[PDB]
């Protein structure tokens, strides 16, 4: 499936944030590929794990 | 969000009863009101929705009924087989919010329960624990009270419970009681008791072994 | 706090159920009037006799 | 009353 | 038939991801919505996400917006939950359920539940041991015998007797959590006494999440 910017971007933080381990970045990435409209929701649940996570 | 406060928490009832449980909906849902029953280890069955209409294939001695934001289920002649958990839910705005749901227990006759005892066995006596086994089956009501003594000494804290749910024919239950100790410990004592208190005795009952005995 | 106000409910031919209501005692006592209430539509006017500062209720239907 | 995991029922 | 199957509950550490499908069959999931409701001691039945097939529309609960999608594959007539950010309060019995079927404005058909068990402990084998029958579990006739199923984690596990060729006079007790953390359940079954020896007793125990099945027979401990 194709994806906008916004989408996009969604994608590319995710992938980098640093305290993640690898299932819960592919976790994460699956659900903004689930559920594109709950992109931005999704987005923040990840900041908040990664931040939790330093 | 829309609450719905279900009464009573519990209801209990003989066989050929009429029951009647609630539902308040905190505020208008229309007709929008689904009723399930969740028995054991089964996931919840559609009985009634839009207030009043029976699902396809319950019976016809379930019946609902709306009034303003009050909503009622009728049991018009309880089966044993009805013992279980019954749960509103509310459909008329997202969220769809359910009561917390009301146990519908049938009453019968009195029972005295079937008492026995099992020592550890063999097996796990291999290692380094025991678990001694008193079960209490086929009986009503569900109060009971079962001790544990050990050389005759009162054991406290060392014990748990467990209650299998209404038997779905007798209407009855039945209950273990599981002692647990170290080996080192069951291999010391002697006497092994389970006593059991129960309305359907005429007095406590004890059911013991000697450790070693066969 | 929780508590459990227990209730007989007796009713005119005799038949006997039980019920329990949970809750801070006075929603617990608020929800089983209304309960006896409804079932008084049905099975007559109710009247409620409460023992053990009002833990308990037996409610009788006059049919 | 609450939901038990171990019972799959209501407690009581 | 309409049939809805959950799979994919199962132990996840807090902050740890899970996906679960709901997987149906004599319906087209275009045709209804599709939910998935979780049921839990904290909050009783609890609805958490649902779906239209036909157009992607979904809808959250709150409490789970951002840590659980909701999704589905009309080509394989299956819907999903990704589950991330996992909490305690996120242990549950997993249901899916359709709405909207054959015109019912309520949720006709659900699964059979699929359970997910947020916690840092680790996977363990039950123990099973027999509880034999004997002179202390016998009366008017009958005997008493059955299987201790110890230790394990997480639930569920599942006994059986016989292959499940022996229903009647069996109990399986609700499991017990011990302080250990492990848990422990005993289920037993009440025979002829002229049976004893002559009639085979076996307890099939499984205990999917450590892979670990165990037929064990029971029969009179002998002297």
């Known amino acids: 499936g194709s994806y906008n910017k916004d989408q996009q971007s969604a994608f590319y933080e995710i992938l980098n944030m640093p305290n993640l381990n690898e299932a819960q970045r592919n976790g994460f990435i699956q659900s903004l590929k689930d559920d594109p409209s709950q992109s931005t929701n999704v987005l923040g649940e990840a900041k908040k794990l990664n931040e939790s996570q330093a | 969000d829309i609450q719905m406060t279900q009464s009573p928490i519990l209801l209990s009832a003989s066989v050929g009863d009429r029951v009647t449980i609630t539902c308040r909906a905190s505020?208008?849902?229309?007709?929008?009101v689904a009723w399930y029953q969740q028995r054991t280890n089964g996931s919840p069955r559609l009985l009634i929705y839009?207030?009043?209409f029976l699902y396809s294939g319950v019976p016809s001695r379930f019946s609902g009924s709306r009034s303003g934001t009050d909503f009622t289920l009728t049991i018009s002649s309880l089966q044993p087989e009805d013992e279980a958990d019954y749960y509103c839910?509310?459909?008329?705005?997202?969220?769809?919010?359910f009561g917390a749901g009301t146990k519908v227990e049938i009453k019968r006759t009195v029972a005295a329960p079937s008492v026995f005892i099992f020592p550890p066995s063999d097996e796990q006596l291999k290692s380094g624990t025991a678990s001694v086994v008193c079960l209490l089956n086929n009986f009503y009501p569900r109060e009971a009270k079962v001790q544990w003594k050990v050389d005759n000494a009162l054991q406290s804290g060392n014990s748990q419970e467990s209650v299998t749910e209404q038997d779905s024919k007798d209407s009855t239950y039945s209950l273990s009681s599981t002692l647990t100790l170290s080996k080192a410990d069951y291999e010391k004592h002697k006497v092994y008791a389970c006593e059991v208190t129960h309305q359907g005795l005429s007095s406590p009952v004890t059911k013991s072994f000697n450790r070693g005995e066969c | 706090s929780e508590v459990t106000i227990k209730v007989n409910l007796i009713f005119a031919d005799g038949k006997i159920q039980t019920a329990e209501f949970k809750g801070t005692f006075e929603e617990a006592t608020a929800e089983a009037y209304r309960y006896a209430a409804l079932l008084a539509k049905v099975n007559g006017e109710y009247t409620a006799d409460l023992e053990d500062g009002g833990n308990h209720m037996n409610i009788k239907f006059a049919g | 009353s609450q939901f038990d995991f171990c019972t799959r029922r209501l407690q009581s | 038939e309409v049939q809805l199957v959950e799979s994919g509950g199962g132990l996840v550490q807090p902050g740890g991801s899970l996906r679960l499908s709901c997987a149906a069959s004599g319906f087209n999931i275009k045709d209804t919505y599709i939910h998935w409701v979780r049921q839990s001691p904290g909050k009783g039945l609890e609805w958490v996400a649902r779906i239209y097939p036909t157009n992607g529309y979904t809808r959250y609960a709150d409490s789970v917006k951002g840590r659980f999608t909701i999704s589905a594959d009309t080509s394989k007539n299956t819907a999903y939950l990704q589950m991330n950010s996992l909490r305690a309060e996120d242990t549950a019995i997993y249901y899916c359920?359709?709405?909207?079927?054959?015109?019912?404005?309520?949720?006709?058909?659900w699964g059979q539940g699929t359970l997910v068990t947020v916690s840092s402990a680790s996977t363990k084998g039950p123990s099973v041991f027999p509880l034999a029958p004997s002179s202390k579990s016998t009366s008017g006739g009958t005997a008493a015998l059955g299987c201790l199923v110890k230790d394990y984690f997480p639930e569920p596990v599942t006994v059986s007797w016989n292959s499940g060729a022996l229903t009647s006079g069996v109990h399986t007790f609700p499991c017990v959590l011990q302080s250990s953390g492990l848990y422990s359940l005993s289920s037993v079954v009440t025979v002829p006494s002229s049976s004893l020896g002559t009639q085979t007793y076996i307890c099939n125990v499984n205990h999917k999440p450590s892979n670990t099945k165990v037929d064990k027979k029971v029969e009179p401990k002998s002297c």
């Open positions: 839009s207030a009043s």
């Open positions: 505020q208008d849902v229309n007709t929008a």
């Open positions: 839910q509310q459909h008329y705005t997202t969220p769809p919010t």
């Open positions: 359920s359709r709405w909207g079927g054959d015109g019912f404005y309520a949720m006709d058909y």
